[PDB]
Ligand binder design. Structure first.
Ligand SMILES: [Mg+2]
Ligand SMILES: [Zn+2]
Ligand SMILES: [Zn+2]
Ligand SMILES: [Zn+2]
Lengths: 104, 81, 263, 98, 133, 38, 765, 157, 65, 280
RNA sequence: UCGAGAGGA
């Protein structure tokens, strides 16, 4: 129920999806990620009202490419990016801790 | 004086509204529906639809200052509202 | 790694200042917010009053208690009342402590968080211990008592998220910045005569090349480098805050992926 | 000139509530008047012995604060000891449109 | 892939900021064509135009086929993109200049162009302004 | 209380009032310009 | 009074209001608690018993539920104190008090109910907080303010009311208030301000947001517009952005003195098919002014579109501000030394002049102005003098304002703007006045203890030299305050005095209504007007238009009207029509040209009599001009080729249309005469703007198109006829009540005959 | 002052004009004064104008001055509304007032009349006069609680 | 009343320094800003909470009950 | 009613009559739409709240508390609302109590001069970031502390609605009083505008269906409320007229029914008839 | 049950 996926009605290869119990937190991230796809033809999102963590997002892509697969690839890329960031931070922090074991 | 009636053939917005309201009333009573149902569960929309394609069997007895009246069938009236 | 490049300029048990490059704006903003909001942590929820012979009102007191920072190393080992099948509460999803103080001498008796006594068993989990940054270790000043005032009460704290209520806020503050030289022209500095003098230079300016007047605006530029100083209240070390927030955002995206697979 | 006397201080011409008005000499008159008026409906603390006093319609602020920009009249007003309000952080801008 | 009905080189007569930080009002005289004068609003911020500059000015009568608006990334295959400042919009007006020239008016999202051409017999709704230099 | 204690009623602003009653502290409604404070 | 003319009622609610940018015009935020307290007694039918049954199963404890079930026998079953909610089976004709849901037409009221605009119904939009939501724009006609205003709620109980409300007080249906032939509402506050930044020439938008605004717009066509900027980078224009919101087919074309087809200042406003070209969007275009965008859209599409228009316009503007932001500050008020210095001399420049005249008066050399006392004239020039300096100071201050100045930006947009503010805000506040006079000697020959007796120096009599930012000296502060109470007194006094005036007027015209015979009588049937408003036309479809036949030189009108097919003076160009020499030399047609010309010539002198003032702009039905452009755009008419029209076709059509302008119906000549009288002015202009010469040279339309215009005109003309049964007097009274809240005792002097005049005077030519 | 005078060329032009403005009102005498335009003479005191010229002329006169008052603040309302009210003020062949001595002193339905500012007084007169109301009146219908014969109710379906 | 626990803006905990705050103010005879700096309240969003707070509790306790 | 027992006091008067006083307490948490006022006459109500992150934030990671529309300021001529923020801000940085007394030499110049010394924009501007993207906000925001206050008018204390509640006896009209389930006093104005709309029926509905609806019986012989209605027997009669056939049912306002009865007390004969004696 | 008074919109 957290994810309601429907096809768009105003353009081909287009879909509108609603995320429940979510806000711009994941919104801007996923939106930029999809915008970073070569094969996407359109992407954007919004919220009906501040009163809900209801998150409605429309996308369009090239022929023969599932927009749902676009989301999947976007998420995979994001998680890879986050793992890399975390590991970089872990190394940086271990060294900064060796430095900070004397001053905290 | 149905002949040479001294008024417009155009329905009045008030007249339109009253017709709509009466039909909504009788629909809510489950009166014989003059139209097929296209999912228009709203009685108000049912009335609006009958108005659109002209199936209301109503006639307005419009009054004049002198107390004289003209009876105008919705059939006679023109709907531009 | 080739991902976002991190360089800590300064680190402290209270706060850590660093630079994050090789990343887009959205990821930085998301990191900021997820740290701000989505972090499991422990906070006082249930307050049962045995006796209040104090000037301060009960609800006043409980409100303040809700603000007490807590040992939150292993909150992951702790669970949510929503999930936990215990009634009311239990150690698996809650921590129990008490406060019992009584005025003894006419002088004001300052009741501090250190007075708090953990009752439930931590299972050895590094959780629940009150957090004290006092030089004297007194702890947070809960309240004050008269010559012979009695105040006894029990508290049950539970695992929740700041987003649910600020009392679960582990993130004290987040300094955040980029393009100190405004090379991206994302702002038109307001000024009477000249922004250059009227506006002060941010300290980060020294770590980036000052722009050149003759340079055409590189419209292709993007905000890659970022400056972030994250300060925690004290519930958890800053490094843990960063790591855990990253992990939570990862979990959110992974849950999205799982929902996609489920449909 | 042959001045016979001198006001000990012009601010003396001011009123009780108006005394709470900061820099009143820079605002447009009726605006000042209204502020004096709302000063009769803002909450704070009425008296220290509220617990002793058995009354109705009490309203005690959880955390009264002394205004940053005080007025010389205040230290007679005792408003510093008994203020009503908070020095909140205000942002003069349009953010969400609401 | 285009059929531009106009093409000429214009020397920049004047550059006017017009109390704007990105766009300047610009006048220019067509090289070799005293009868062709160009008024144009240009985002100098992205196109560092200078006074007296000789710019290649033409209108994409037909879309310069790269071989709802198609997305960006139109650099994949080659077209009349050798130009530097390329705008799109509509032919605003077709005023007749003494039956000798046509002070046609154009708008580019509000950015305006006027040009005198009965010689440049171009007529349509929308096209692209192609500026090289 | 502070003002209300010093409040003054006018049974149903001149220069003389200068230095006597606050030209600003006046209620709204019909009382406006009638009820004064010292 | 307290029981019949007014009473308490039920099914009603009242609470404080709150805003919602995300909300539509006919929608309203309904506090969930209220919904749980208000329901509707709907009648069970086969087409709703299903959800009704479920609603009953939900019961009173659930937000989408019901509280009582009413059997046909009248058994108002209580589900609150009964488990029967899961047991009763609904039967047709049963009534169930269904919890008010969304989309339910409901009525509001902001008190005091000044006039009609106070009364609009809306659609329910439940919300989880304890206050009402209102779409920003509606407030002005509501005369609302979010300082904590409360508003009444009225919930209809009989569906006939639902429709009745839905067709008589639905928000869009009154978008134009007939009190002043202008939009009742418009864009306001931040949105008004923000647009200016959005629509300004200098703006540009990155694709990231352009993608966003499109889906942010609810009714977006789903089409990606082309970026204005291509080669150096993809980008669009705010003008482009706003155009997407606008619906197609709009052809508002406003010109200004600065309009030259180039408009470096982008004044005026020009849009084609919704595509913006010229003019920075300003209050004059999207405000409540009649000459603005909204009014046009209202007639070109109809109310049910404009509702979408607002939300579409609204939602965008707030967004683009969200990622831009907007603020102000003291810097917006401060100016440079030079500016203040210049102001400084300006004040001193006046002060000496005051001093100069002062000595002159002291000399007994200043003479008394005609019919006026030297004492007052001495003051009159004095107060006059001080006004200019205060005025010029703001003028001077205005010149040196930077574009970055937000307030200047605020004022230039017109959102709550006021020049005098900034001048007072920045320059000297200016003279204080009471009963329009300087400070009187409340003390013996003086005003305050700080001034010697018998002094008239500007400051000594209430002038203010310093600026608000500079801080008023006690002397200034006191004087400035004095004027305050004056305004304050009239503020309260009006809140009661106007109502008494207002109440009388309503009764005075209560039984005044329009009759189906196109006449006006009282409850006694006594005629008031033979033709309502003497034209039988509803004000709601009237707007000011040019009367071209009035203005211009005598030589002028003939040139722009007269055509000669025989001589050289007014030779028609044959190329204008597919027929050339076939027409030229045609005396028969030339005759046809004649009666029109003389007819127009008669009209010119006739209108001269009508409007002795020479003004050629007056409220009339149907914008002929607008329709013409629609025709041009209707088929993108080629105005460079001959047309198939013929003069006979032109001449007959105007004659035919005139015949078609039938408001009355009585075939008796007496009625027919009135019909001729009613449309007299309108037909004259019709002849004017439909003159063959104008029809040919300027308006190069096709025969098919030209006729389509005629058919188009009559359609609107008929639609514009005032409806019968109108409670016009009540409307007219309200038309007077409103402006009363904003000379006025003079009005009261009018309403109450009061033979004893206050200010008797004569005007002698 | 100037005037919008159509010039011999056909165009309206500014024509400066001298006009006398004075205190008081006496049309009877001034109208006899030579060297003036008696026809164009205007004044504030419409009440006198009506007496001087006629009820209908005053009706227009009232509009002008009323228009001036509304125009005085720069606001605008449609011509019709202004015209409607004044015309009512003269239907009785005289300058009717909207006060208790004018509009109220009518011959309409008492129930309509009673609800204005005087109720009990008129009530006695009605019984004294054995008056009877038509029920066409709104408030009378309101008192009855019946759909007034107006607008949406001005007709029978 | 009594010192708030967390910075209204930051949430940074402060209901522990009141004692040291007054110590520096009186025992060290410093100006307010000096101590606040010594207290680590770099952001004026934090400084404000402490510069303005008026201790009323000490007065309430003066009552016998 | 929402609260708990705070204190109960039991005592007697000088006469020994027992008296009890009960104190209860609750904490009101600022709700949307609650009135706030400045120290300058600026007022308003709460629009909507957010979480710290959502609101725009400073480079130094500072979250604003309250946001107000700039448009309000210049139109209302309230500079000091800005000035205090400047001086107040300086006070916080300088940690020195401010002085807002009038007619002093204090001026923006030294104030702003001092601010720049602390290292902040002399006019109080600051560079903010969108609380949704983090993208730098194109404009700069006026930002700083200020003293506000909370006014007694509580939204939850204002809400009020009802339907089919108790109705007041004298007129069978809806009772009045929020605590007493009061109605809304439908005044003269509303119907007037309704008349303008012309929604007569919806006028008939409220005045009738909302209240005062009542069935009455009238004698054709005399338009007087004198009909005996033996509903238990379906038997009717008008004594004096002794007519058992000219009885008609009518729905009239209950309050009006009293008026006629009041009028009949006045000795007036406002006889009513459903049959217009006029022919044409 | 009335009366008064405060306050809001
Ligand atoms: Mg208000
Ligand atoms: Zn547990
Ligand atoms: Zn802080
Ligand atoms: Zn009888």
């Amino acid at each position: 129920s957290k994810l309601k996926i429907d096809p768009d009605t105003k353009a081909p290869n287009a879909v509108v999806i609603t995320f429940e119990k979510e806000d711009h937190t994941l919104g801007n991230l996923i939106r930029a990620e999809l915008l970073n796809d070569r094969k996407v033809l359109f992407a954007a999102y919004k919220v009906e009202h501040p009163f809900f963590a209801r998150f409605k997002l429309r996308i369009q892509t090239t022929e023969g490419y599932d927009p749902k697969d676009a989301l999947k690839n976007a998420c995979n890329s994001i998680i890879n990016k986050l793992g890399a960031l975390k590991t970089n931070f872990e190394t940086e922090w271990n060294l900064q801790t060796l430095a900070a074991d004397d001053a905290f | 004086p149905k002949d040479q009636r001294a008024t417009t053939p155009y329905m009045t917005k008030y007249e339109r509204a009253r017709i709509l309201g009466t039909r909504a009333l009788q629909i809510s009573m489950n009166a014989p529906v003059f139209v097929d149902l296209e999912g228009e569960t709203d009685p108000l929309r049912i009335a609006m639809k009958e108005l659109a394609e002209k199936k209301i069997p109503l006639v307005i007895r419009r009054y004049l200052p002198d107390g004289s009246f003209e009876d105008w069938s919705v059939e006679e009236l023109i709907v531009d509202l | 790694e080739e991902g976002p490049q991190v360089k800590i300029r300064e680190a402290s048990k209270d706060n850590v200042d660093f630079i994050l490059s090789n990343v887009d704006l959205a990821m930085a903003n998301s990191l900021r917010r997820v740290m701000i909001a989505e972090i499991p942590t422990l906070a006082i929820d249930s307050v049962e009053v045995e006796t209040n012979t104090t000037v301060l009102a009960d609800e006043f007191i409980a409100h303040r208690l809700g603000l007490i920072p807590l040992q939150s190393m292993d909150i992951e080992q702790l669970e949510y009342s929503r999930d936990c099948f215990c009634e009311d509460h239990c150690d698996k999803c809650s921590v129990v402590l008490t406060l019992q103080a009584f005025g003894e001498s006419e002088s004001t008796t300052n009741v501090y968080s250190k007075d708090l006594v953990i009752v439930s068993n931590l299972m050895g989990r590094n959780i629940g211990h009150p957090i004290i940054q006092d030089k004297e270790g007194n702890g947070v000043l809960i309240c004050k008592l008269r010559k012979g005032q009695e105040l006894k009460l029990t508290c049950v704290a539970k695992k929740g998220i700041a987003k649910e209520h600020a009392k679960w806020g582990p993130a004290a503050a987040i300094e955040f910045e980029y393009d100190p030289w405004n090379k991206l022209k994302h702002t038109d500095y307001w000024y009477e005569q000249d922004s250059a003098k009227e506006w002060p230079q941010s300290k980060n300016c020294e770590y980036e090349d000052p722009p050149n007047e003759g340079d055409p605006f590189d419209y292709k530029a993007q905000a890659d480098t970022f400056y972030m100083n994250v300060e925690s209240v004290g519930s958890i070390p800053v490094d843990q805050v960063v790591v855990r927030g990253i992990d939570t955002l990862q979990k959110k995206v992974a849950s999205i992926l799982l929902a996609l697979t489920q449909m | 000139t042959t001045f016979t006397h001198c006001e000990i201080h012009p601010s003396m011409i001011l009123g009780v509530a108006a005394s709470i008005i900061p820099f009143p000499d820079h605002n447009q008159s009726p605006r000042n008047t209204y502020q004096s008026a709302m000063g009769k409906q803002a909450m704070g603390v009425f008296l220290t012995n509220y617990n002793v006093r058995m009354d109705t319609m009490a309203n005690i602020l959880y955390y009264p604060q002394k205004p940053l920009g005080t007025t010389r009249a205040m230290e007679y007003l005792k408003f510093r000891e008994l203020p009503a309000g908070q020095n909140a952080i205000v942002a003069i801008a349009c953010y969400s449109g609401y | 892939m285009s059929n531009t009905l106009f093409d000429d080189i214009f020397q920049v007569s004047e550059v006017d900021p017009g109390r704007y930080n990105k766009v300047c009002r610009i006048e220019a005289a067509s090289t070799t064509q005293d009868q062709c004068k160009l008024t144009l609003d240009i985002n100098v911020e992205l196109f560092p135009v200078a006074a007296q500059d000789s710019l290649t000015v033409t209108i994409a009568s037909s879309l310069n086929l790269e071989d709802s608006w198609r997305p960006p990334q139109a650099g994949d295959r080659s077209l009349a993109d050798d130009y530097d400042y390329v705008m799109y919009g509509t032919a605003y007006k077709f005023e007749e200049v003494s039956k000798d020239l046509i002070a046609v008016y154009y708008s580019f999202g509000g950015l305006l162009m006027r040009l005198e051409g009965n010689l440049n017999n171009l007529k349509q709704e929308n096209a692209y302004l192609l500026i090289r230099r | 209380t502070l003002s209300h204690l010093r409040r003054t009623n006018t049974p149903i602003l001149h220069n003389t009032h200068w230095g006597l009653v606050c030209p600003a502290e006046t209620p709204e409604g019909q009382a406006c310009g009638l009820v004064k404070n010292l | 009074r307290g029981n019949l003319m007014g009473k308490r009622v039920d099914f009603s609610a009242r609470t404080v209001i709150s805003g919602d940018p995300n909300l539509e015009l006919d929608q309203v935020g309904v506090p969930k608690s209220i919904a749980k307290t208000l329901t509707y007694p709907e009648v069970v039918t086969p087409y709703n018993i299903d959800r009704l049954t479920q609603l009953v199963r939900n019961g009173p404890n659930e937000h989408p539920g019901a509280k009582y079930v009413i059997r046909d026998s009248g058994d108002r079953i209580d589900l609150r104190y009964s488990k029967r909610a899961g047991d009763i089976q609904l039967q047709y004709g049963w009534k169930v008090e269904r919890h008010i849901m969304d989309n339910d037409p409901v009525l509001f009221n902001r008190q005091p109910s000044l006039h009609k605009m106070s009364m609009m119904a809306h659609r329910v939009k439940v919300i989880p907080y304890s206050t009402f939501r209102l779409n920003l724009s509606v407030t002005s006609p509501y005369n609302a303010d979010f300082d904590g205003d409360e508003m009444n709620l009225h919930v209809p109980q009989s569906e006939e009311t639902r429709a009745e409300l839905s067709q008589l007080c639905a928000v869009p249906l009154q978008i134009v208030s007939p009190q002043s032939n202008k939009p009742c509402m418009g864009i306001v506050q931040d949105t008004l301000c923000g647009i200016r930044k959005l629509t300004l020439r200098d703006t540009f938008i990155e694709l990231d947001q352009v993608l966003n605004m499109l889906y942010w717009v609810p009714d977006w066509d789903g089409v990606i517009p082309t970026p204005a900027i291509i080669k150096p980078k993809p980008l669009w224009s705010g003008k482009q952005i706003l155009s997407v919101a606008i619906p197609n087919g709009i052809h508002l074309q406003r010109f200004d003195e600065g309009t030259t087809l180039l408009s470096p200042k982008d004044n005026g406003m020009l849009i084609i098919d919704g595509q913006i070209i010229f003019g920075v969007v300003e209050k004059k275009t999207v405000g409540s002014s009649n000459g603005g965008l909204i009014h046009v859209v209202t007639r070109e599409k109809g109310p049910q579109v404009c509702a979408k228009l607002f939300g579409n316009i609204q939602k965008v503007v707030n967004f683009w501000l969200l990622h831009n932001g907007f603020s102000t500050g003291i810097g917006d008020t401060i100016a440079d030394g030079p500016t203040m210095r210049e102001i400084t001399e300006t004040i001193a420049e006046a002060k000496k002049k005051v001093l100069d005249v002062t000595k002159e008066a002291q000399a007994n050399l200043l003479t008394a102005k005609h019919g006026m006392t030297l004492r007052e004239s001495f003051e009159d020039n004095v107060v006059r003098f001080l006004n200019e300096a205060r005025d010029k100071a703001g003028r001077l201050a205005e010149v040196n304002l930077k574009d970055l100045n937000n307030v200047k930006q605020m004022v230039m947009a017109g959102s709550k703007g006021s020049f005098i503010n900034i001048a007072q805000m920045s320059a000297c506040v200016g003279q204080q006045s009471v009963e329009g006079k300087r400070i009187a000697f409340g003390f013996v020959d003086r005003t305050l203890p700080h001034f010697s007796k018998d002094d008239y120096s500007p400051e000594s009599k209430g002038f203010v030299e310093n600026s608000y930012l500079r801080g008023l000296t006690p002397q200034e502060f006191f004087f400035h305050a004095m004027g305050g109470r004056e305004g304050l007194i009239d503020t309260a006094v009006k809140t009661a005095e106007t109502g008494y005036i207002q109440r009388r007027l309503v009764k005075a015209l209560e039984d005044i209504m329009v009759h189906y015979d196109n006449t006006t009588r009282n409850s006694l049937g006594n005629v008031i007007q033979f033709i309502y408003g003497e034209d039988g036309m509803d004000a709601a479809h009237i707007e000011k238009q040019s009367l071209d036949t009035i203005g211009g030189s005598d030589a002028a009108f003939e040139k722009r009207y007269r055509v000669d097919l025989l001589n050289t003076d007014h030779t028609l160009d044959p190329s204008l029509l597919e027929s050339g020499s076939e027409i030229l030399g045609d005396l028969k047609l030339q005759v046809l040209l004649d009666e029109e010309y003389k007819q127009l010539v008669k009209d010119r002198k006739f209108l001269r009599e009508v409007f002795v003032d020479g003004e050629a702009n007056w409220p009339l039905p149907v914008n002929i001009r607008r329709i013409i452009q629609n025709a041009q755009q209707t088929f993108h008419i080629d105005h460079t080729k001959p047309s198939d029209l013929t003069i006979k076709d032109i001449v007959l059509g105007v004659k035919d249309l005139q015949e078609n302008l039938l408001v009355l119906r009585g075939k008796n000549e007496i009625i027919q005469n009135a019909q001729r009288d009613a449309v007299t002015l309108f037909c004259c202009l019709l002849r004017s703007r439909l003159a063959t010469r104008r029809v040919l040279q300027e308006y190069r339309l096709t025969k098919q198109a030209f006729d389509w215009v005629l058919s188009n005109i009559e359609a609107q003309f008929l639609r514009s006829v005032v409806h019968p049964g109108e409670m016009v007097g009540v409307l007219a009274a309200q038309s007077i009540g409103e402006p009363a809240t904003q000379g006025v005792p003079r009005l009261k002097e009018i309403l109450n005959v009061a033979k004893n005049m206050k200010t008797p005077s004569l005007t002698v030519y | 002052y100037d005037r919008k005078v159509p010039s011999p060329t056909g165009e309206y032009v500014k024509e400066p004009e001298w006009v006398l403005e004075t205190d008081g009102v006496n049309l009877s005498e001034v109208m006899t004064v030579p060297g003036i335009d008696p026809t164009r003479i205007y004044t504030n005191s419409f009440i006198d104008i009506m007496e001087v010229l006629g009820i209908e002329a005053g009706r227009a006169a009232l509009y002008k001055e009323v228009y001036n008052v509304i125009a005085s603040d720069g606001s605008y309302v449609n011509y019709r509304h202004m015209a409607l009210l004044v015309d009512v003020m003269t239907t009785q062949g005289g300058l009717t007032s909207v006060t208790r001595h004018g509009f109220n002193r009518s011959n309409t339905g008492a129930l309509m009349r009673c609800s204005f500012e005087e109720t009990v007084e008129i009530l006695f007169e009605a019984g004294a006069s054995a008056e009877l109301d038509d029920c066409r009146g709104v408030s009378e219908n309101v008192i009855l609680g019946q759909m007034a014969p107006i607008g949406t109710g001005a007709f029978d379906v | 009343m009594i010192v708030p626990v967390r910075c209204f803006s930051c949430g940074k905990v402060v209901g522990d320094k009141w004692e040291s705050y007054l110590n520096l103010l009186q025992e060290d005879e410093l100006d307010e800003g000096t101590a606040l700096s010594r207290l680590g309240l770099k952001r004026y969003c934090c400084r404000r909470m402490i510069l303005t707070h008026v201790d009323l509790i000490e007065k309430f306790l003066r009552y016998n009950p | 009613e929402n609260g708990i027992v705070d204190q109960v006091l039991v005592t007697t008067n000088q006469d020994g009559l027992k008296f009890v006083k009960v104190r209860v307490r609750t904490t009101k948490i600022p709700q949307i739409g609650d009135k706030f006022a400045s120290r300058h006459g600026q007022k308003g109500t709460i629009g909507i709240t957010y979480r710290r992150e959502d609101m725009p934030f400073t480079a130094e990671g500072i979250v604003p508390d309250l946001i107000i529309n700039p448009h309000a300021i210049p139109s209302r001529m309230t500079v000091a609302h800005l000035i205090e923020c400047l001086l107040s801000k300086v006070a916080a940085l300088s940690g020195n109590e401010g002085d807002a007394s009038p007619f002093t030499d204090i001026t923006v110049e030294g104030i702003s001069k001092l601010l720049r010394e602390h290292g902040y924009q002399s006019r109080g501007f600051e560079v903010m970031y969108n609380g949704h993207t983090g993208k730098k906000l194109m404009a700069q925001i006026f930002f700083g502390p200020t003293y506000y206050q909370r006014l007694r008018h509580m939204v939850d204390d204002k809400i009020h609605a009802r339907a089919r509640g108790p109705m007041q006896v004298l007129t069978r009209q809806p009772v009045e009083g929020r605590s007493r389930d009061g109605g809304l006093r439908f005044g003269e104005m509303e119907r007037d505008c309704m008349i303008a709309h012309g929604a007569a029926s919806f006028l008939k509905e409220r005045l009738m269906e909302a209240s005062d609806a009542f069935r009455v019986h009238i004698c054709g012989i005399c338009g007087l409320m004198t009909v005996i209605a033996k509903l238990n027997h379906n038997q009717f009669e008008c004594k004096g007229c002794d007519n058992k056939i000219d009885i008609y049912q009518i729905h009239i306002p209950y309050a009006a029914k009293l008026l006629f009865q009041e009028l009949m007390a006045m000795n007036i004969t406002p006889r009513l008839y459903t049959d217009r004696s006029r022919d044409f």
